[PDB]
Each structure stands twice: as C-alpha cells, then as structure tokens.
C-alpha cells in the first residue's frame, strides 16, 4: 500500500505555490463547487420545461432513432451509437460523492497485469526507438501561452505577466533548479524559482452517462461510476473501495428542494488536476515543435482536422480498426519514465531537466472538497515524491504519452499477431528508425491513425492482412487481451474524435464513411459542461464564448451526419413542444448576439464585418475554445482570435533555453 | 388442386384441351373487394369479355378498372 | 497462315486442339459431360497498337510508368523475364542505395570539394546526366533503365535543394504486347506489381524536411546530403520487399478460381463465406476471362496446392493484392468482345452448305508513313543516340507506299 | 419453376399516431359489428337452437356501440379461393364417380373425397377451439 | 495462338462447361470449356457428331465451323 | 366547401407557410392520412391523371414556394 503522505491542507508548501492572495488562499481553502451552469445565458441547467424538452428529446427520438452499429462495432444505418438519454442528468449538478486518486496503480497495472517493461527486448528497442525519434530532430519556434489562463498551481494568478516571470526565470535557471532537485533541493527552487510543487484536483464533468431504458418497466440506468476512496487511493488500490457516487436528484429535491423529473441524475465528476507551468514551458517549447514535427515529418497518423483529413487516408484501407482504450491516464508505466529519462540522457537531454520531468511526472497532489465534508487533504511529499498517480492533467505533453504507448502497443500488437515475420525488417534500432519513419509515413500494410487514446488502424493487399483479420477477431471477442500495458478493446460503436466512421453492407474502410456526430451536437447544445460566469466585462475569462456560432455552423459542422436535417426537425419541433417557441430564432439571435459581443472584441475584422475571416473549424473553436485545451492543438486557430485567445512568448529565450535543454 | 390433378385418370389428351388451371389471383379480388364491389361479378365479365354496361361512373368503369390490371 | 482438316485436326494440328493445352491425348479426345455453368466474361483489353513515346524525364519519378517500361523492355530485351530483372534490380539497389560510400562520392561530384555543403550558397554545376555518367562509372547494368531511375531519385530529393539546374528530359518507346498470354507473364506482372511499391517507397516519402537542414537559410551538409539520402534510401529499401512470393500468390488465387470453376468435386477447397465474395474476388468471379491460366497451370506444373493457403487468408489480402488491380503492364482490362472486335469472319462455302472454306482474319493498318534517321550522339556511352528523321526520303518512300494501301485491301484480299 | 415469391403486407401502426392525429380514409372502414350466429341442434325430434351476442365471446361487457373494426383485405381472397376451389373439387370428383368408370378410380376419388373433407375438418378445430371460439362452444 | 480462338469463341456462344477431364491419369486438375452454340441440322463436320440441336462442343473452332459468316 | 377538402387543408398550409416567418407559428398541430393500395399499375387514363398531377407538382409548388422571406 504505502500511503502517499496525507499532509494537512495547511502547510507552508501549500502556501509556497499559491500567491497567498484572494484566489490563492481561497483555492487552498476551497469548498466543494456546485451550481447549475447557466447552460445558456439567461438559462441555467435547471429549467423544468426544458427538462421536459429533454424528455421528449431523448425519449421520442431514441425511439425514432435506434443506433446502427454492427456486431463488429463497425457502424451502419442512421449511424447512431448512443442513447440520447445521456442528456438526462443534472447537467449543472454533479453526481456526488467523488473518487480519491491513487499514488500507484502499479499493482493495478499488475491486475490488468500491465507489463513492467518490454515484452520482447526487441520491443524494448522499439520503445527506445519511439523515444529515439520523439527525441530527435528539432526546429525551435517561439513558445505561446493562453491569455487569461490562470497560473493555477502555483500562484493561481490570472495575469499573463506572472506566467511570464515564471517561465522566463525558468528559462534562466531551470538548469540550476533541476540540479537542485537532482541535489534534492526541491523546495529551494520551489520557493525561489517556485518551480514544480503540486497538483490541485479539479473536475472534468462527463456531460452524459450511459442511461439505459428498460423495455419491461422504463428504468433509466446511467452507467455506474465506480470510484476510489481515500484509502483505496493511498493504499495504491490496496485498501479502500470502488463505488458509485450518488446519481440521485431527489437528494437535491432533498437539499435544494429542486424538483426531480425522470431520468435526470447528475453529471459525472471526472477529476483533472492543475499544476506548475515553469516546467511546462520547456514542454510546449519542444513538444509543440515536435507536434509540428510529426505533423510535418509524418502527419498521416497524426494530422487532425477535417473528417476529410482522415477519411481520405482511410477509405484507402482494405481494413480499418478503431481502437478502444482503458483508463487512459492512470495506466502510464513508470518504467516507461525510466526508459524516457534513460534515452533522454543517452541522447544528451539535460539531466536537470530530466529531473524536472521526473519531478512533475511523480509530482505531489492535493484534494479539495470531493464531497461536502471531504478532502482538503494535501498529498505527497515534495521532498521525496514517489507518486505513480498516472497521467496528471497538468501536463499538456501527456497527449504525447498517450499517443505514444497507444501507437506502440498498437503497432506492436500488429507485429505480435499480424506481422511477426515482418519484424525481420526491424533488425535493430536503426531499422526501427527507417521503419518508424516509414510507418508514420505509412508506407506499410499494417496502419493506424492516432491521437492520445483515440485511434484507428488500417490494412491492404500484401502478405500480412489475414492475421489482421485474426487479431481483429480476437480483440472483437475481447476475451483475452494480448496487450500487457493496456486493456485495449475494440470500441463497439467506435469513432475517432467524433468522426464516426460508417460502413455499408460491404462493411469496408472504402465503404461508408466518417460523420460528425449529431448526438454530439446535441451535447454541444445541452450536454457540454461549463457555465460562462456572465458577470464579467470580458468573455475571455468565460469558459464558453459563443454557442450561437455552432448553431449556424451546424450543417457545416455535424451536417456530416446524413440524417442532420431530421435532427433539425426534431429540435425545433421539440422546442415548440417545450417553450413553445422558435429555438430557431432563439439561437439565431444568440448567434447574432455572439457577433455583437465579439464585434468590439475584434478590431481587424472591422466592425461587424462578418465571420468570413474564421474557418468553420475555427468557428468550431470559437463556439468551443475549450476543447483546444484537450482536443485542438494551439496552432489550429486562425491567428486573429488565436491571439485573442493566446499570447506570444519570445522565440529567443526559449531558443537558447532549448539549446541548453536539447543535447545542444 | 395440384393434388387433384391425378384425378381423374386416364390420359386424354387432344380431344378436350388443356385447361385454365392457372389463375386464382388474390390480387384481382383484393383490388375490387377493397371497394367492396365484389370482384366475383367482374370475373364472369372477363369470361364473356364484354362489359355488361352497368352504366354508372362508379359502377361500369370500375369493373373495367380491374380488367386492365 | 496454314490449313488442317476439321475431323482430323487432332491428327493434324494436334497441339492446337486445346485438349493439348491439357496433357490429354488418350484413346479419348477429352470431353464427356458435366456441370457448373457461368460465361467467364470480361477479358483484359487490347494491348495491340497504341504505340507511343513515353518520357522518363523528370526526377519527380513515376514508378508506375517505369514499371510498364520494365515489362516492356523485358519482353523486348535481351533477358527474360521481368522476374529475374526485378531480382537484378534489387541487387543493383543494394549495390547502390544500400552502399553508402558511393553517395559520399556522388555529393563529391556535385558540390563536393571541402567543408560541404559550402554553407548556404547555391551553385548546382550539373547536367542530370553528368551524374548519370558518374553512376555509369559505377556498377554497370545490362539494362540501365533503372540506372536512370536511380538518378531520378537523386533528383527527387535534390529537387528541394538548388540542384534542379540539370533538368533535361528522357524518352523511350513502347512495344506491342499480345493477347496477352502466359501466367508466367502474370508472374512478371505481380513481381512488377511489387515494383510499384518496391520502388515507390524510395520514390516517395523521401524528404520535404531539411532545407537543406535549415539552419537559415539552409544548409551546410558534408556527407550529410549523401547521408540523409542513402541511409533513408536504404531505409526505404527496407520497407520495400513485397514479401509475398511471386509465383505462389498467383498459383493460389488461380487455384481457388479454377476449383471454383470445378464441376467435379471442389472437396475441401470450396466456395464459402469470407473465403470468397470478399467484395472483389467475386469481381474476379466476373473476371473469369483469365481462364487458360489454370490450364497451363496444371500443364506447366501440376497440382496447385495453395500452400500458404490459410483460410482467413486469402481472401483477406492476397487476391486483393492481385496484379490487375495493381495495374502494371500491358496487363490490360475490359469487357468482352472488344478484343474479338478485331476478328475477321467469312463462312463462304456452299450447298453442303458448311464445309470446305470458312476463313477468318483481321482488319488492319496502312498509315503509309515510315521513317529513317542518323544516330547522333552528343557523348559516347551506350545508345542514348539522338536521331532526326530524314524527311526527304522519308516522305516520298511513304508516298511510295500510298497506293499500296489501296492495294492489298486485306479484307478485300480475303475475298480472294 | 415454383415461385420465389415472398410478398406479404402489414397493418399500419395507426394508434401510435392517431393517439395524436386524425386519419381520413375514415369513413370507409365502416361501423362494424356482426354477428348473431344462431344454430340448431336437432337432438331427437327437438330443436334447441341457440345464439350469442358477439361481444361476450370476447368476454367483454357489455355491448359496445361504436367500436370500429377495419375491413381487412387479402385474406378474403384466400379464403374465397379456398371456398370456390373446393367447389371445383367436389364437382370434379362427384362427376368422376358419376362416370369414370371403371371401379378402381371411383373408390379412389370417393376415398379421396373423404379425407379432403376430413382434412378441412381437422383444420376447422384450429379455427376455433384454441382461442377464442372455445368461448363460443362454452 | 490458343489465346486467339478462345476469345472470339466467347461471342458465339456464351455456352460453357465442360468438366475436369481426369481420364485415367492424373487428377491434378484438367478442365477447359465447352460450347453448345446452336446449329443447322447436318454434320459432315466435326468428329463429335452431336448435331442434336447443336454441338456441345469439345473444341472452340467447331463453333466457328458451325458459325455464320 | 369542397367535396374533397384535402387541399382545403393545403390552402391553410399555405397560409401557414407565409405566416410562418411572422409570429403565427403558434397554432402548429399535425395532420395525418393513410395510403391506399394501387394495382399493376394500369390504364393510360390513369397516366393522364398522373401527368395532370405532374402539373400539380408545379401547378401547386409555385404557390407552395417562392412565397416570401
Ligand atoms: Mn471520434
């Protein structure tokens, strides 16, 4: 077990991060957040007539529109793969209590029996190769940072200039400080450079849940959310328990007294964590160029834009295999850290910085108020941290890790069960070089698309495919997973970033095609996550700028879903059945007001010039900036609002900085 | 009726056909019976072929309305 | 042209009797009676005529056309078949692309002197060509062809850098191909089908990266150009292989086809589920025109064991990986009678009425024009000889042929 | 050749929509509730005819005024064809025994005749005493 | 050369099959094609007398031999 | 009155279509009607019906459409 030390919230270390101000001390002292999101301004999540609108919506429509994914998990028909009832929650009120994150799933990795290192030593070499290349050619470019992004841990300053001082001083003595950590002087850099420190628990909120109608009596059973307690946590999955949080709304018919219409539970309380940036500066400064690298040197498996972007790569394929990933974060191996740091150093990457990683990569955490009468438990010991808490959200390069080991285990498994004889062209580390290059160049029969956990796969004429069918079959059975690092199933109802690949009768990659999910659109409408906090002059702080945009963008967006317009029918209809009015004109006017609001926000798009400057994708990024923090990469935005969203960082300081960090 | 065929032996065959044997259409009945016209009268009307001129716009032509089909 | 008795044709043109296509001789003239019917439909098209020049030309390199060329010269050349030629090509590809020291010398012939790649400066003192001579100094091919293509490869990766300077052009003629015949030729077609991707992987991927490393503006590069080129080129050689055996893959897919065709027992071989009609092999069920391949298959060889059979495979990939879909060659493809649409036919004959004279033939050319030339050669090496027509004779001799086309109207000639 | 032939229609869901909205082939579909099928049982030299009022065969009570059955089609043609073809049957067979001619055949047909009726006999019980005409005999 | 006749032995006629013709040696497979075509009622041509309606027929040329000009 | 209102609904539908842009979407209910089986299908007079109806497609839509935004 070995508890990760449970220091009281009160601690000087707890202070050193925070600016010891308003939001700082408050966040230290923060109570459990709760509150209906103003799901539309002038419209919370709680309106009962709108709740009946959900009622008609998910009921009458799922009724009319049952899912069309086949046995293989490959998709046909309407292309629905999902209950519409995932709307049906307190989508402003979280399902409570909450999990307590572990410190070591290593035994949990020994339960899923996830491997402690290489399968074959060849595989080791493979690891070393992906590492070899992700740690290879570099063309540094100026770093950039979100405007209005709170410094979070440490100080929680909203000021950009804070982030400036932090990141720049980090550019100045990350060497000295990472050395201090190598010297073990964690708190010295942590209290002078204020580098590193801790994570702060926050929430992702699953907007939906797998509500399941009961034919025999109409029960609406959302998927249960098994979660750890503090003991299951500190005793790395050892003691403690795994358990659903209460889904009930009557507990707010209790507490809030709020009326409880059918099927309307409460959104899942997934938990991200914030953390110090000064080390994330080197992270973006390289990875973002590395992002650009693989997107340039390769893309292919890597480029992510239009469904077209992907589809074109796909229908090509004789065979295609959407992936399905178990708890994507927690499962990341620490021996993987071992090889990371290994070949970092082997390839001259800066040992102090390497120490900086391992610091962050096992950085101490903190729990706020997971339930009322819970948390405010400081965790870990920033003097000898040892956490194996899995992929903490504070890193942005975690995506690199996911995309990594996933692509690994993918391709590997393809060797394992489709192309072992072909491993013969993988004679060594250099062979792994030409190869991996070529595979991410795609000049291979076995194939993939990848983005963190989400991924797919591909195959062709040439002497390897039938085993692809086989491995396909086994995984489709899922009866045993060959993967010793992950529980990777096929996703029945598989998709890639909401690109729901469709199949026809032939069920082929060349058959039917991706669609932008329309149910997902419904989510965008009604089951997203955040409110805006309208009580601020600038929307830059606001979680969710301009929803009306998505309205207009809808065909341009998820009109990729064939049945699109019928969905329009249903929405407008059900709204006339709801508030008895024009959600049409409603949302139109919301769009108009979006243009109004943005109008003063924007200059070069002179007055209300029109929205022609913004890509429909960037339009998606403007109704939805938020996924840019966990979907869109930064460069994607057109430079205008890109800068409205982001601010530049000096190329030079970062340059020489990398020159230090890099083996030159 | 197919089973009836062996009845009755023995073989003819030239002296008297042959037989209709064939029609017994569900379709022709339903097409007229839907209007409750009773198709069966239309049947003999195709026996002699000529319509029996039941002069009424929803009588006579409706018979013929079937005959076409 | 010749003649033979009809009743006695087996005693006459005994080889021509199709029963001969099988080892049949016997007391019996094959035949008998049995079962399963389907007109074998959609034959591969008309490779006859359609002669024209093609341009090797640019280093931007189209593998596809080059493949077509390989089969072309192969039939036309001094060394059958394509198969051995592809082997020899792979050998050369080792001796070149997989033999790095060469490339040092190549860059040395380019910008090579000292402290390469002479910083950011341009200077591309080269005809494409001069490289070609330098490689000609290297290992000779009996059939250079690719020896050009390797140069083309040098161009393709040196194209992003300032060495587009040499750009000239390269040209080569077709060569008429027949019906077209033997499954061994198909073997050539499938190994060439590999060449499509045996080659393109080096023809492609390549590099947009490095300008010339940039390193503003880009770039110094000692052996680094030759480095990055060859080591990647060798790496490109690694992904290339095609793995799957030439004669085997055709032997198997032909096996499944012919036993599908079998009226007598398929036995363990059989039509099945995903064993067949995998949204393409059934198109081959429609491409049953390549019949005869089974014929010589048993004849050229014998039993057609699928050996790498599997049962998932293949199906799966191999029939997918069939040549015509990879479309090299004069392999050609088409519906039915267009290939027959050059068949003459005259029953003639009388009273009996059927037999004594029933001829066939073909409609044909006389574009009278025919040409001649000097073989000018700007530099000695092989046969890259420039030629210019000699119109003064070339026209009139063709003019001399002008009546002659009206003469010997072969169709009318048949009437004879 | 023997038909491929698979076509067979289906009643429209109706109630699921007219729970909301009016349909207009109505009237047409009619009123529509027969029948008082009395029948006698001539037990020796006595009548004892009995009858029953449709609705309670369904066990429902009481009389309904305005329930409106459709006028289902299709089947009419089948059963009619069945009926008329029996007419063809017994006419043919009876004529056959009337002269054909030649004993070996007559018993055949008159034998044939029997099970034909016997056949229908059997299936007629399936028409009834198995839901819901057991109520009728009751 | 063989490839010649077969092709225009396709048109006239899409008649097919034939059998594997194992004989006494040896069944490794041996199956060409057959052509019933359609014929005039006289056969001083072809050892395979099979005029009956039409030749069936073992070899491609006879089709043409029975073919129209 | 119409003997056959049908379009009498449709004219109202037209009233809705142009009053839809304006705030009179308030009434919106629903209207439903059954099919009717048709035969083989027969007579060219029926085709005449079909072609005048073919006109109705555009005899009507011009008022059903254009309309006004
Ligand atoms: Mn997706």
Residue numbers in the entry:
A (entry chain C): 1 to 664
B (entry chain A): 417 to 485
C (entry chain B): 1 to 416
D (entry chain A): 555 to 692
E (entry chain B): 486 to 554
F (entry chain A): 140 to 208
Please share text taken word for word from the publication where this structure appeared.
Here, we present a general computational method termed ‘localized reconstruction' for solving structures of symmetry-mismatched parts of macromolecular complexes. To demonstrate how localized reconstruction can be used to address symmetry-mismatched components, we focused on the RNA-dependent RNA polymerase of bacteriophage φ6.
Finally, we present the structure of the φ6 RNA-dependent RNA polymerase at 7.9-Å resolution, demonstrating that the structure can be determined for a symmetry-mismatched, globular 75-kDa enzyme inside a 15-MDa icosahedral viral particle. Localized reconstruction provided the in situ structure of the P2 polymerase to sub-nanometer resolution. The application of the localized reconstruction method to the polymerase complexes of φ6 exemplifies how this limitation can be circumvented, allowing the structure of a viral polymerase to be determined in situ. This opens up new possibilities for studying RNA replication and transcription in the context of the assembled double-stranded RNA virus capsids.
